[PDB]
């Protein structure tokens, strides 16, 4: 009910440290496969943690 909102901008977002880690039990991307995350740029990204 108090979900966070953190802005992400002007950076590089390599996922070889995130997706390759076995800790993240749940990882479901509803728009693309996790592989294509690095090969495509992005825009203003909001980091919402709960």
């Amino acid at each position, epitope marked *: *009910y108090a*979900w*966070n*909102r*953190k802005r992400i901008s002007n950076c590089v977002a390599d996922y070889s440290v995130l997706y390759n880690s076995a800790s993240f039990s749940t990882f479901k991307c509803y728009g693309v496969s996790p592989t294509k995350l690095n090969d495509l740029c992005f825009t203003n990204v909001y980091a919402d943690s709960f």
Partner: nanobody
Amino acid sequence: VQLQESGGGLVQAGGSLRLSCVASGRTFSSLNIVWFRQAPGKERKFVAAINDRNTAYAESVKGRFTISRDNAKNTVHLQMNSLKPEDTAVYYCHSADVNGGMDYWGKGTQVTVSS
């Protein structure tokens, strides 16, 4: 940064206290104050919550509890009256912005009621 809380003390039953919640930040008005206590050996339950000028209290804490905010000094008071032994617990103040992010938790202050 851990929040600083003060204003509690060991007094007899029916006493009064004034708990304080202190945080650093110019947006102290846009945040919210929520109170939670854990009785010794018992589960933590709801205490109090204030939303700007709004005041809400639970089933067994209404009437006795009264919370007011002084957002200019970055200090929110939690006035206490008619302490009872079932209220003997350590109180923590919770911070939540308009969305609920950037939350902070502090050591808190010890509140004890003597019979």
